[PDB]
Design a protein around this ligand. Structure first.
Ligand SMILES: CC(=O)N[C@@H]1[C@@H](O)[C@H](O[C@@H]2O[C@H](CO)[C@@H](O[C@@H]3O[C@H](CO)[C@@H](O[C@@H]4O[C@H](CO)[C@@H](O[C@@H]5O[C@H](CO)[C@@H](O)[C@H](O)[C@H]5NC(C)=O)[C@H](O)[C@H]4NC(C)=O)[C@H](O)[C@H]3NC(C)=O)[C@H](O)[C@H]2NC(C)=O)[C@@H](CO)O[C@H]1O
Length: 485
């Protein structure tokens, strides 16, 4: 909001009022972190001061003027900042105009839409055709190979989830061989939500968990001792530290609390590290659902962090780099070593020409990671992507579907993001969509591979827009402002 304070002779004074009007919590409005403010004037700037005292840093670039709120750029609930601008009249456009608030968040960040519900779809009593565009491609068992890394830029199928359960010839954690394995259906639905919400490749999370703590992989290796697991009447070993508080993704307590502060819209105030990550042999453990999602958020944080600093050069880097897996290598490296490690690489600045021309990015920059973390994850991901013969599937009962959303309701979002009525209304849509899609299989169940993405999209139609909230808060403001990769 802006207002003319004083107009007299050759001097114009405008009061720009910025605020977070929200008194209570609202979606993506619990806090606002402002990078900078830009307005336009042909007149010369005399003084820019706060109304309550002091003054912000401002920069003039011709008609464009960039105001820096510095330590006042953070806007929590019920917080107003008024800026008084004094201009000496000059040119044909003296009045300050075209005010643009720039949030501390990469505006050029992209999240690939995996698929969409048919345009005819409506909340209430939709038909089967309102769920399925064409029955041919929807139930098409044929598999198309892909080469996606961390982000699914080009999904193999619009409505299907393709988890490549391929054999791994690569020595995973000093093992002879390895076999990709989904522990249970609830963890799979976890990956699916992480895939539809934050556009994260399920194969990448599978590969990550395998390297971190054998969470998603079994082996024939006699040397490795673990739990007895049988696939196709063959004995396999599952060497997972199931008691590890950091879970199968090895998400540290410090990283958990950090992204918790970054994303209040995602995490409730009661979000505890152990309850969210620590899984067990019991498939009914809620952490089977939460841990792949928490990992997806923590991974997303890094991508959001780079975008906030690098800005537009991120997209330029993706299209000009000679390494196809480049982004995946960076993100995976920052997951294991930390975001500071990526920053210290100075890839997007000092070593721009070296990384952008690197055929293999992790080899030149020595981004091996602990125990060859980065090369392991990439190769397994590539293998799972290349797998077309053996794709994961499961039978999801209604009790499975309802349990999943129950856990989501309890472990994610804040009170007020989704009303009780809006949720019950969403469930009726999910219930109907389940019933309609179950007919193809006999009414006993739906396919995780073929139907569950549709189930999510139906549910997410009632989820607050935009679905992906902004990283915000005090901690995010300092880190993202000073981040220089
Ligand atoms: C040779 C071989 O193959 N051996 C295998 C072996 O790989 C297997 O053991 C398991 O290996 C993995 C590593 O590959 C072990 O895991 C962890 O993994 C964690 C997640 O990647 C990682 O946590 C990250 O560490 C960063 C550095 O501290 C953190 O960044 C920092 O966070 C702070 C607070 O947020 C912040 O203040 C700092 O600024 C920030 N630092 C920087 C530079 O920015 C980061 O937050 C954190 N990430 C997350 C998501 O939590 C651990 O560092 C890493 N530890 C080690 C020693 O590598 C895993 O623990 C191993 N498993 C077990 C049971 O120990 C093994 C399979 O079990 O088989 C062998 O054969």
């Amino acid at each position: 909001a802006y207002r003319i304070v004083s107009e007299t002779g050759d001097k114009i004074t405008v009061e720009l009022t910025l605020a977070n009007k929200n008194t209570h919590y609202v979606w993506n409005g619990w806090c606002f972190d402002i990078k900078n403010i830009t307005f336009e004037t042909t007149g010369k700037v005399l003084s820019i001061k706060y109304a309550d005292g002091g003054e912000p840093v401002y920069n003039v670039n011709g008609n464009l003027v960039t105001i820096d709120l510095t330590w006042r750029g953070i806007f929590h609930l019920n917080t107003t900042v008024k800026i008084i601008i004094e201009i000496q009249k000059s040119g044909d456009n003296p009045y300050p105009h075209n005010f643009k608030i720039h949030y501390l968040r990469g505006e050029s960040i992209i999240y690939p839409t995996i698929g969409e519900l048919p345009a005819s779809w409506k909340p209430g009593n939709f038909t089967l055709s309102d769920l399925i565009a064409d029955p041919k491609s929807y139930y098409d068992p044929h598999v198309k190979p892909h080469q996606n890394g961390f982000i699914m830029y080009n999904p193999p199928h619009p409505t299907q989830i393709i988890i490549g359960l391929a054999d791994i010839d690569y020595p995973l954690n000093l093992a002879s061989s390895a076999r990709m394995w989904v522990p249970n259906k609830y963890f799979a639905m976890g990956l699916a939500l992480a895939y539809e919400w934050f556009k994260v490749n399920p194969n990448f999370l599978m590969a990550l968990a395998a390297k971190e703590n054998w969470g998603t992989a079994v082996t024939k290796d006699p040397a490795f001792k673990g739990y007895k697991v049988i696939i196709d009447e063959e004995e396999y070993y599952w060497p997972v530290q199931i008691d590890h508080p950091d879970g199968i993704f090895q998400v540290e307590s410090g990283n958990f609390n950090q992204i918790k502060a970054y994303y209040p819209d995602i995490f409730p105030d009661t979000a505890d590290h152990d309850d969210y990550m620590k899984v067990s042999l019991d498939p009914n453990d809620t952490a089977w659902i939460t841990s792949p999602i928490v990992a997806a958020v923590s991974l997303t944080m890094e991508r959001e962090l780079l975008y906030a600093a690098v800005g537009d050069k991120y997209n330029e880097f993706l299209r000009l780099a000679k390494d196809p897996w480049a982004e995946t290598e960076i993100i995976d490296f920052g997951y294991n070593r930390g975001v500071g490690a990526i920053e210290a690489l100075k890839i997007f600045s000092d070593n721009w020409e070296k990384a952008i021309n690197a055929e293999v990015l992790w080899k030149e920059f020595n981004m091996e990671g602990f125990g060859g973390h980065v090369p392991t994850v990439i190769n397994i991901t590539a293998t799972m992507d290349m797998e077309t013969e053996r794709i994961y599937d499961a039978n999801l009962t209604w009790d499975d579907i309802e349990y999943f959303f129950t856990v989501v309701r309890q472990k994610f979002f804040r009170p007020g993001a989704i009303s009780d009525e809006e949720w019950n209304a969403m469930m009726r849509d999910v219930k109907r969509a389940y019933d309609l899609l179950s007919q193809h299989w006999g009414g006993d169940h739906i396919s995780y591979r073929y139907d569950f993405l549709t189930i999510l999209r139906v549910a997410m139609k009632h989820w607050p827009e935009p679905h992906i909230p902004r990283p915000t808060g005090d901690d995010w403001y300092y880190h993202a402002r000073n981040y220089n990769p």
